[PDB]
Design a protein around this ligand. Structure first.
Ligand SMILES: CCCCCCCCCCCCCCCCCC(=O)OC[C@H](COP(=O)([O-])OCC(O)COP(=O)([O-])OC[C@@H](COC(=O)CCCCCCCCCCCCCCCCC)OC(=O)CCCCCCCCCCCCCCCCC)OC(=O)CCCCCCCCCCCCCCCCC
Ligand SMILES: CCCCCCCCCCCCCCCCCC(=O)OC[C@H](COP(=O)([O-])OCC(O)COP(=O)([O-])OC[C@@H](COC(=O)CCCCCCCCCCCCCCCCC)OC(=O)CCCCCCCCCCCCCCCCC)OC(=O)CCCCCCCCCCCCCCCCC
Ligand SMILES: CCCCCCCCCCCCCCCCCC(=O)OC[C@H](COP(=O)([O-])OCC(O)COP(=O)([O-])OC[C@@H](COC(=O)CCCCCCCCCCCCCCCCC)OC(=O)CCCCCCCCCCCCCCCCC)OC(=O)CCCCCCCCCCCCCCCCC
Ligand SMILES: CCCCCCCCCCC(CCCCCCCCCC)(CO[C@H]1O[C@@H](CO)[C@H](O[C@@H]2O[C@@H](CO)[C@H](O)[C@@H](O)[C@@H]2O)[C@@H](O)[C@@H]1O)CO[C@H]1O[C@@H](CO)[C@H](O[C@@H]2O[C@@H](CO)[C@H](O)[C@@H](O)[C@@H]2O)[C@@H](O)[C@H]1O
Ligand SMILES: CCCCCCCCCCC(CCCCCCCCCC)(CO[C@H]1O[C@@H](CO)[C@H](O[C@@H]2O[C@@H](CO)[C@H](O)[C@@H](O)[C@@H]2O)[C@@H](O)[C@@H]1O)CO[C@H]1O[C@@H](CO)[C@H](O[C@@H]2O[C@@H](CO)[C@H](O)[C@@H](O)[C@@H]2O)[C@@H](O)[C@H]1O
Ligand SMILES: CCCCCCCCCCCCCCCCCC(=O)OC[C@H](COP(=O)(O)OC[C@H](N)C(=O)O)OC(=O)CCCCCCCCCCCCCCCCC
Ligand SMILES: CCCCCCCCCCCCCCCCCC(=O)OC[C@H](COP(=O)(O)OC[C@H](N)C(=O)O)OC(=O)CCCCCCCCCCCCCCCCC
Ligand SMILES: CCCCCCCCCCCCCCCCCC(=O)OC[C@H](COP(=O)(O)OC[C@H](N)C(=O)O)OC(=O)CCCCCCCCCCCCCCCCC
Lengths: 365, 365, 365
């Protein structure tokens, strides 16, 4: 009755966000839209280089602003709700076409916003939202790892069917992370040119070893028996991903060969694909009867919409490769304020996991 | 059954007003529509300067007139209702697409109204509606402040979690208001040129201090214990906002540097954004099971629609920056009849709050 | 169940008539449609002056003919009904989109009717319908005045809240009527040129004084205590309105300064706006559970549709300012057959009220 319709609503909102992202990403195609994008919002006209070179980025900004506003509004409405008997529960579950048309309407109206001062404000808002959503998806990954490891250990160790896979998953994740760290050492640093990259990569490797060291010692396993190695494995893979994605945006042509060492600067590579896939997996696991974010409500109706606002901003930032608006083309898709945010996010996430796993042991002895 | 559908209707009307405002504001874009707006309603042709320079303003007038008429009509229908069993309750809750199409139909029909005598009449109607809605939203803000302060004081003071925030909110609002009053002193007045601004700002500061002085004395707190400082803080912030918005329209180029000291005169700044945000918050708090505006009806079905008529007129005025139609471009977006209305509204609002807070104390001793 | 759906139907028919009137009045715009109106129905071509000068008038005729036919047909169907159990009750309440599409379909089909002999026949039909609907709305106004005066006197005189308003309404209506009669004396007559206007205005003033004299004497109040002054006040205001609207169409350039003393002759002034507002108020008060026009039916299903036919014809006539088709432009929007109909309607209405108020007193003594 009520619960199944509420969960169907939780999935309908995910479908809304998905349709919005797919519609936003149809832009920035190499030649199929970069000439069509000249009509919609540059009729108003360091501004000229941005209107002339990167059109898909502006289109993505104007599209995702609409979804951010829609989900912020839905968060403001569903504020203070206590039980499923409130009259506002009736508007969250029934009227779907109105919601679709409002969301898209907002996108179409926002596309008319001219350029000149809209860029940088949204860059800062996107940085904040990206930090928030990175931390949220780290929490989701940790919860999923706990659940999976516990389930396989409890249900499978009576047999030999899943134990092999239980070892193989963590072995494959470790070898992927190690090959990735070696590829970083090989490519994204020189002999004596860039030291900051040799600092970032090395300190992330140190944290990724200390985390798996602390995750196994028996004093922690005494409280919960399933400390295992899978959790630390998935976490270290994710942290290596963030290390690579953060070093990718180094605004120094001395060493960085990614972009620095052409009629456009909009690019789409394997990095963005991996990012979107991890994003989608986290969003779907958030909606499957989970709160890893009659009387009583399972999930707070406002925190859910706030999480979707953060997710929409994260998509805004990751589809545009975290660039700085109104910058000359020689700088070419790299800013300095994004790498620090990403790497501080990675460090805070490693701290969160290492603390939540071994807080009382350190508090006592 | 009945109540949940009635509240869903109260929110559907807010969605109607929101869609109308968003559609009205897509106009007045700097170059994306100012050339398209030449066909619709100037084919008829101090009138020529208005048709040639400010097209977005006329489009906004013609759009918002339709919503004003629609909500006035809905107010006239739902007149005299007593209980939820009347046959007219069936038409207020069910037929939504007809209502959407009637409202938009009215907008599309009104866009055909030619120029020449339509402007000034609507300017006066908009002034009256703006006065009414400013006072309404002041009442809503005062009620919200009472509710929030009472809730936090009663539920939180047993702990230390919210007391810090209870002090921080009022501290932040006070520092914002003080920095704003200082910025007004710095910018919107000269040494010896404009004295009327040094009068308005100073007298508003005097009222904003006396209000917080009276809000704290123990004789008033004897009746209600939660007199506090949050109410006076939010009220003084709102009054400083109105002081700034009223001084912005001074029709004197001697001192005012806002607009006085270009192919168009339609502008959109941070002032309009703050105005629209406060507007939206007040409209949403009006609809959340509140009447701060089986047998018996919670809210009078006609007063609600009258409040929405006033709200639509207020949007009409604030999206067009309160200008005077059919005025030469040198005057440039400033009239004299708006500043007096805004400031008299501010003074009457301060009087309303100061009276409602300390009426019986003054009546007795 | 049945009653609420029947009343919703009574309001849906009013919405149909409103949408039809709004669509008909979008025409006759000064330049926005007078060039577009050259294609639709003059491809067929004292006829040429009407096709060349007044296009909005013909468009309004062709539009309102469709609604007249639709409501006449609905009147013919719902003939002889006795109870709410007849099978024809099922078609009056359910199938709305079909009705909308039939009505508009009829309008679109009627727009194809060519010119040459369609004008004058519809002028005479419109005169008859206008007489009928003027008398109907007079009856509605009298009933409303009785209801309002009785309600305020019975519920309010225990207090002092509404007595002031009960006097103020009648005072304001009297002063409006007197200023109007003086403005007529000043403007619409000369010193010795037009005597027929000095006859009409003076005799209407005499009737409007005698009516208020008879409405107060105690012999009439003996039967019903609420004879009062409000009824006579609203009635005399309405009669002064009809006097002004009838004198406006005097086909004499000697005195009349309204139109007599330009590429078109279609005009739209404050007269038409007041007319449409009074029309809308009467139509809405007709539908609010009233018959001022299980077993048993409250309102006769055929008389309602006949009243709407008369209303549609009245709108047809008042949107076109009661002009004579196929007349030379020098005559310019004034005919002689309309003023007599309007003024005879006014006199018959004053007679109806004066009789219904004081019939038995005169019959006995
Ligand atoms: C306890 C605390 C107190 C209580 C709470 C208080 C709440 C208030 C605080 C929150 C708001 C803070 C605002 C800023 C604070 C200070 C920061 C600052 O300095 O910012 C200045 C900075 C610009 O200042 P500036 O440097 O002096 O430049 C002045 C001009 O911008 C320079 O102009 P230009 O050279 O760039 O050229 C002109 C340009 C100037 O344009 C701009 O600057 C950007 C304009 C963006 C408008 C966004 C409006 C959002 C309103 C939301 C709420 C109302 C919804 C109803 C509909 C509203 C429709 C507009 O374009 C225009 O003039 C506009 C053309 C027409 C645009 C029409 C758009 C229609 C589509 C709307 C889609 C969104 C719909 C939302 C609802 C959806 C529902 C389904 O602000 C921005 O750049 C704003 C960026 C976006 C911020 C979003 C914030 C949240 C909004 C929600
Ligand atoms: C207890 C008291 C007694 C009981 C209650 C009494 C109730 C009656 C009193 C209330 C009414 C008072 C009227 C004024 C009183 C005196 C004030 C005064 O001096 O005003 C004169 C002043 C003009 O007088 P003037 O200086 O001699 O200039 C003469 C010409 O205007 C100069 O012409 P021009 O040079 O400007 O050029 C021509 C121009 C002249 O045009 C104008 O002057 C503006 C025309 C505005 C028309 C608005 C009509 C509203 C009717 C509402 C009720 C009926 C609804 C049914 C559909 C009606 C469709 C029209 O355009 C036209 O000729 C019109 C072209 C075609 C327009 C077609 C529009 C179609 C779309 C309609 C959308 C709205 C639909 C409403 C329903 C929606 C439902 C979903 O009036 C105005 O400017 C009116 C402004 C708007 C006032 C709205 C009032 C509330 C209406 C509701
Ligand atoms: C107890 C009593 C007995 C029992 C009851 C008896 C019932 C019968 C009596 C009632 C009828 C009386 C008729 C007149 C009586 C004598 C008065 C007289 O002398 O009139 C002559 C006078 C013309 O005679 P004339 O001076 O020798 O001129 C001859 C030509 O007209 C000169 O031609 P022209 O130079 O003007 O040029 C040609 C012109 C000539 O055109 C005309 O003269 C005007 C034609 C108007 C046609 C209206 C037809 C209404 C039929 C309603 C019932 C059937 C509905 C089914 C669909 C029918 C579609 C047509 O145009 C055409 O030839 C027509 C072109 C195509 C038109 C297509 C229109 C399609 C749209 C139809 C929309 C309405 C739909 C209705 C149903 C809607 C349902 C949702 O008649 C008119 O002008 C008629 C004006 C409108 C009267 C409406 C009466 C009520 C209709 C309902
Ligand atoms: C829920 C809310 C729904 C809101 C809907 C709003 C719809 C707004 C439509 C906006 C839009 C299409 C783009 C839409 C993008 C949508 C993206 C959707 C994405 C997801 C799917 C309309 O395109 C217009 O194009 C015009 C081309 O002539 C037509 O003009 C016809 O002839 C006219 C002769 O005067 C008549 O006047 C008009 O009547 C006619 O028609 C217009 O009819 C037409 O509307 C904008 O197109 C633009 O095209 C350019 C010429 O390429 C226009 O001209 C430029 O303007 C100067 C300004 O400074 C420039 O400096 C200059 O270069 C140039 O002069 C622009 O002005 C603008 O119009
Ligand atoms: C629920 C109610 C629904 C009611 C719907 C009503 C729809 C009314 C449409 C109105 C409108 C579009 C704008 C609509 C704006 C909508 C805004 C919506 C906003 C939210 C989304 C129709 O545009 C017309 O444009 C014409 C252009 O030629 C076409 O003419 C075609 O060829 C013809 C050859 O003779 C045929 O005769 C016709 O048959 C053909 O088709 C018309 O077919 C077309 O309809 C008005 O456009 C205007 O365009 C201009 C030329 O730019 C027209 O010419 C001007 O008029 C003089 C007058 O004095 C001017 O002095 C002069 O400069 C010029 O001569 C205008 O007259 C007017 O037409
Ligand atoms: C999340 C899963 C773990 C991902 C770990 C990634 C570790 C970093 C890899 C890394 O830095 O590769 C770098 C190498 C460099 O080659 P190139 O010729 O210089 O091309 C430069 C390229 N245009 C650029 O983006 O600078 O790039 C290459 O050699 C080509 C790209 C290989 C990327 C492989 C990533 C893992 C894929 C499988 C993931 C799990 C499924
Ligand atoms: C509601 C919340 C409180 C708002 C208090 C506002 C107090 C008045 C501020 C004020 O007068 O700023 C004035 C200064 C003047 O700078 P400028 O270079 O001359 O620009 C002129 C500009 N074009 C204009 O509109 O004349 O303008 C500026 O320096 C730039 C605008 C700053 C506006 C900041 C308002 C508060 C934002 C945060 C609100 C709470 C969230
Ligand atoms: C129904 C409510 C009562 C209405 C009483 C109306 C009494 C007659 C008024 C009257 O005759 O005014 C006549 C004066 C004449 O001015 P003008 O410069 O010659 O303009 C001529 C104009 N073009 C015309 O139509 O000849 O016209 C004017 O001076 C301008 C028009 C004023 C109309 C005011 C009517 C009442 C409005 C308020 C109604 C109640 C709300």
């Amino acid at each position: 009755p009520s619960c199944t319709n509420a969960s169907s609503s939780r999935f309908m909102y995910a479908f809304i966000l998905l349709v919005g992202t797919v519609l936003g990403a149809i832009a920035l195609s190499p030649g199929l839209q970069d000439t069509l994008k000249k009509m919609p919002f540059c009729i108003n006209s360091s501004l000229q280089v941005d209107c002339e070179y990167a059109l898909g980025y502006m289109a993505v900004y104007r599209v995702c602003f609409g979804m951010a506003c829609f989900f912020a509004l839905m968060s403001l409405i569903m504020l203070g709700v206590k039980s499923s008997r409130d009259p506002r529960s009736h508007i969250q579950n029934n009227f779907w076409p109105l919601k679709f048309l409002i969301c898209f309407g907002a996108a179409i109206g926002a596309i008319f916003i001219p350029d000149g001062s809209f860029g940088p404000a949204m860059m800062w808002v996107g940085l904040i939202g990206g930090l928030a959503f990175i931390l949220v998806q780290l929490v989701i990954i940790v919860d999923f790892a706990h659940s999976l490891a516990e389930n396989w250990i409890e249900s499978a160790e009576n047999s030999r069917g899943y134990y092999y896979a239980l070892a193989g998953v963590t072995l494959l994740c470790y070898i992927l992370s190690l090959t990735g760290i070696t590829l970083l050492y090989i490519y994204f640093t020189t002999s004596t040119g860039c030291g900051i990259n040799k600092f970032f990569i090395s300190i992330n490797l140190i944290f990724c070893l200390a985390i798996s060291v602390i995750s196994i010692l028996p004093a922690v396993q005494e409280r919960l028996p399933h400390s295992g190695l899978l959790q630390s494995s998935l976490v270290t893979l994710y942290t290596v991903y963030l290390t690579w994605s953060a070093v990718a945006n180094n605004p120094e042509k001395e060493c960085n060969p990614g972009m620095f060492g052409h009629t456009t600067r909009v690019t789409f590579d394997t990095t963005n694909i991996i990012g979107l896939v991890v994003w989608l997996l986290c969003i779907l696991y958030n909606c499957i009867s989970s709160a890893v974010e009659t009387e009583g409500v399972t999930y707070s109706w406002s925190m859910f919409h706030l999480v979707f606002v953060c997710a929409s901003l994260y998509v805004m930032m990751t589809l545009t490769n975290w660039y700085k608006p109104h910058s000359e083309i020689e700088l070419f898709n790299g800013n300095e304020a994004s790498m620090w945010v990403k790497i501080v996010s990675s460090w805070l996430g490693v701290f969160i996991y290492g603390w939540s796993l071994a807080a009382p042991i350190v508090l006592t002895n």
